[PDB]
Amino acid sequence: KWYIDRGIPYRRGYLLYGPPGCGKSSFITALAGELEHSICLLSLTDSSLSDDRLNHLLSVAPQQSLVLLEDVDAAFLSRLTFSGLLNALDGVASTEARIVFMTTNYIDRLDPALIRPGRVDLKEYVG
Amino acid sequence: AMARKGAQLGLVAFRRHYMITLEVPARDRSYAWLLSWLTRHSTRTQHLSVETSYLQHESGRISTKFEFIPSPGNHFIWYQGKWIRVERNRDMQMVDLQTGTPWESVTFTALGTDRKVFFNILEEARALALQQEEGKTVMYTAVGSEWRTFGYPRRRRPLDSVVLQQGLADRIVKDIREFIDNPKWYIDRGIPYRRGYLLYGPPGCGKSSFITALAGELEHSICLLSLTDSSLSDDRLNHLLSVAPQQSLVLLEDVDAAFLSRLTFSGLLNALDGVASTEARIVFMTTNYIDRLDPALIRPGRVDLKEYVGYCSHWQLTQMFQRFYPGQAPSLAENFAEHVLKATSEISPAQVQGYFMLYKNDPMGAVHNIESLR
Amino acid sequence: TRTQHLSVETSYLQHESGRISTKFEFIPSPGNHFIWYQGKWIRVERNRDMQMVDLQTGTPWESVTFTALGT
Amino acid sequence: AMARKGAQLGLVAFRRHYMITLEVPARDRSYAWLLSWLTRHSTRTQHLSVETSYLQHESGRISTKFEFIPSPGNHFIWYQGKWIRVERNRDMQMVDLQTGTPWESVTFTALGT
């Protein structure tokens, strides 16, 4: 109600960057189970999907389905795109309770534009 | 034998002259509505049965809702100045073929010659049954030459959530309503029942959001299309425009790219002028600017009146501040708007919305950080 | 107009985007009715037979009869 | 004829003013839940029937689980400060089209308001 009253899209994004072997995916699955919400994983580092395909699959995600993505460094360094993913994330076409999580090894290759309102809200680092 | 005949004649005369009744079969949807209404009206229903609505939502979500119905048999209800008998007879003879339930019906039985009581009860039951549902807007996409139900029904965005000008949105809504509710005027004069609107303005003005909001307020469906893509052709555009569903406003974007250049500039207007149309064919065209276009596009049988969306005004700024923050000092909002205008003149509503997101539940901090925005 | 005994039937249509269009109509209740038409009083019998169900539709057998004096 | 009318009026008044009841059809999913709950609550259910859940898991795994339900008829249960009659009537007239079972229902019958 707070979001719909102010006319803001009901979407959220989270970022988890940290050293490999920290069990970020396991923690994501555990929090999805505790919240009882469904999880949908995707590997954006693969070149099989395109920017438009990513936009469709992000928009056609089922209800209460947290969408998880990994390896932003490879795609952002380079189908392959760096601003296309954020453009698709900023698209108006969404679903009810659209929560996206992004797990990666490091934040060096990324930009502050990705961490913004309407995008990843607060940054958390696993130690 | 004489006693039986006399009793039969007396009973039939009594029913025909002094007695009123109404019947609702189980097949009719009014059965459940009337049962729920009678359950709600009478709190102390000692005899009752239970029915549960069980839904298996994804990931093993059990959602069970309990509801209570009057038990089959006889009940007495005190309504108005009357005592009404309610008979819920579940016939133990045969089973409905369509549903797979034994034959059932309900009867309301009352003394008098005032049928208006039954009409009022039925209208109240209809209103109670209808009030639970929430209106939704269904999104539609275009693939090849076919419109498809893309995604899921969308919650209707309130009109006040989007602010454009003092009365520009009001004028647009009034004109749309006037066109919609007067088809006789158009058909009498032998003119096609089509309309077009143009919204050109700087990006970030929320034109698409305003279109969705007005579609929700009008309760009409929306069908978006990106004509700037080369996937569709002129003939494909003509087919999809002509095959658009009823009461479906069709929205198009980025006229500049196609008109500058499948790709066509006069083909789109030729398709728009085509006789093949649908009932209440309303087209909206949103774009960044009007420079690349021609006055021929803004003509009768086409976009009727041109409206331009501007940047944030002092009234717009204070209205959006009030909408974001539920109740503060109006002087604070006025000072906020004045500071925003002093810092920037071409400020867009998207930037203000993002700034308010940055300072969620922080009115004073946002006010003091206007100079930071600069 | 003054049909004291009657039943109701609704036509419910689910138009696109969740449009509920319900229209209420009223029918004489099953049983006996008397109508004054022309110079005649005509009996109308709406008998809903509680024996069997129509296979094609899935409703109990029904019929209506108009009964009048004269040739 | 007067005795029958008086008895009918007395019975209908008794049911309407002093008596409470609840009905659950066999189609509703609450039927099995209530049957299992009444089986669990009353350990000494002398009259009962049995139903088995048989599952054929891969590689020829037979997994059969036995469950017990009150037998059709009349039962008496002592709950709270009340004695409640439970009537499980399996009607021998017609068969449900959706499932393929004879029409069944359960009724809880109690004194009070």
Residue numbers in the entry:
A (entry chain F): 213 to 290, 306 to 354
B (entry chain E): 30 to 290, 306 to 418
C (entry chain D): 72 to 142
D (entry chain F): 30 to 142
Paper text:
The human AAA-ATPase Bcs1L translocates the fully assembled Rieske iron-sulfur protein (ISP) precursor across the mitochondrial inner membrane, enabling respiratory Complex III assembly. Bcs1L is a membrane-bound oligomer, with each subunit consisting of an N-terminal TM segment, a middle Bcs1-specific domain, and a C-terminal AAA domain that is highly distinct, forming a clade of its own in the broad AAA protein family. Here, we captured Bcs1L conformations by cryo-EM during active ATP hydrolysis in the presence or absence of ISP substrate. In contrast to the threading mechanism widely employed by AAA proteins in substrate translocation, subunits of Bcs1L alternate uniformly between ATP and ADP conformations without detectable intermediates that have different, co-existing nucleotide states, indicating that the subunits act in concert.
Previously, we reported the structure of mBcs1L in the absence of nucleotide and substrate (Apo mBcs1L) determined by cryo-EM with imposed C7 symmetry. When we imposed no symmetry (C1) in reprocessing this data set, the resulting EM map at 4.4 Å resolution showed significant asymmetrical arrangement of mBcs1L subunits in the AAA ATPase domain with appearance of large crevices between some subunits. Inspections of the model built into the map confirmed that the separations between neighboring subunits in the AAA domains are not uniform. In particular, the separation between subunits A and G is clearly wider than others. This asymmetry is also reflected in the rms deviation of 1.222 Å for 2,259 residues when the C1 model is superposed to the C7 model, which is rather large compared to those identically calculated with the ATP- and ADP-bound structures of 0.285 Å and 0.248 Å, respectively. The apparent weak AAA domain association of mBcs1L subunits in the apo state is supported by the calculated buried surface area (BSA) between pairs of neighboring subunits, with lower BSA indicating weaker associations. In particular, the BSA between subunits A and G is the smallest at 4317 Å2. Calculations of BSA for ADP- and ATP-bound mBcs1L showed on average ~1000 Å2 more buried surface area than that for apo mBcs1L, suggesting that nucleotide binding stabilizes oligomeric states. Furthermore, the structure of Apo mBcs1L, when reconstructed without imposed symmetry, displays asymmetric arrangement of subunits, suggesting a potential mechanism for substrate ISP precursor release. Bcs1 subunits in apo state show significant asymmetric arrangement with large gaps between some subunits and are more prone to dissociate, which implies a mechanism for ISP precursor release, where Bcs1 subunits open up laterally in apo state to let ISP precursor diffuse out.
